[PDB]
């Protein structure tokens, strides 16, 4: 089950709306390229908001392999903040680079969904 991003050339797996800090994701994160994206193209993931430009993430780097970039255990270490969420920004380093944003924001707190 994939969802589209704000970029028509990219799709990605579904992420929770709210999750616990540093806890493994329920669904392994991956970015699917629909267009021309050569194998070996680096892809980085970044999370942040107004207060936090780039929050600490774990395993936020991957490389394209046959139109797919799989992230090995992506985790949100840093918390989004009280009453705030994160905006996931995907950057596919093609020539030139293409940026995509997750269709929705993700909240990261110490306890997670209560
Ligand atoms: Cl952080």
């Amino acid at each position: 089950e994939l969802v589209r991003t704000d970029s028509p050339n990219f799709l990605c797996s579904v992420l929770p709306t709210h999750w616990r800090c540093n806890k493994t994701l329920p669904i392994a994160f991956k970015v699917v390229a629909l267009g021309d994206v050569p194998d070996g193209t680096l892809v980085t993931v970044m999370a942040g908001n107004d207060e936090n430009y780039s929050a600490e993430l774990r395993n936020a780097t991957a490389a394209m392999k046959n139109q797919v970039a799989r992230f090995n255990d992506l985790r949100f270490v840093g918390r989004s903040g009280r009453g705030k969420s994160f905006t996931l920004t995907i950057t596919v380093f093609t020539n030139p680079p293409q940026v995509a944003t997750y269709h929705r924001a993700i909240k990261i707190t110490v306890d997670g969904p209560r």
Side-chain angles (χ1 to χ4, degrees):
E1 177 43 45
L2 292 180
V3 292
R4 64 238 296 177
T5 64
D6 76 329
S7 174
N9 283 153
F10 299 94
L11 265 36
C12 68
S13 50
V14 186
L15 288 174
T17 52
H18 192 193
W19 203 239
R20 168 177 289 180
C21 291
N22 200 41
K23 181 177 179 186
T24 294
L25 296 169
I27 301 174
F29 189 72
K30 65 177 183 172
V31 177
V32 179
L34 296 170
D36 176 25
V37 183
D39 292 328
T41 293
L42 259 40
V43 181
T44 64
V45 162
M46 184 191 281
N49 51 39
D50 305 303
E51 276 52 58
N52 223 318
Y53 175 70
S54 181
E56 171 174 30
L57 300 177
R58 205 58 173 171
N59 316 114
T61 310
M64 277 285 173
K65 183 176 69 177
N66 305 319
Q67 297 274 262
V68 185
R70 297 190 181 71
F71 293 75
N72 174 206
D73 185 39
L74 170 66
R75 283 187 271 109
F76 298 73
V77 182
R79 49 169 73 65
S80 56
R82 201 175 71 224
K84 292 197 290 69
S85 288
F86 275 151
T87 288
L88 208 288
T89 303
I90 313 177
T91 303
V92 182
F93 290 92
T94 39
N95 184 187
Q98 301 183 60
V99 180
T101 303
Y102 192 79
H103 73 69
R104 196 162 298 167
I106 178 174
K107 201 182 213 308
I108 302 296
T109 62
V110 188
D111 316 302
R114 76 211 315 296

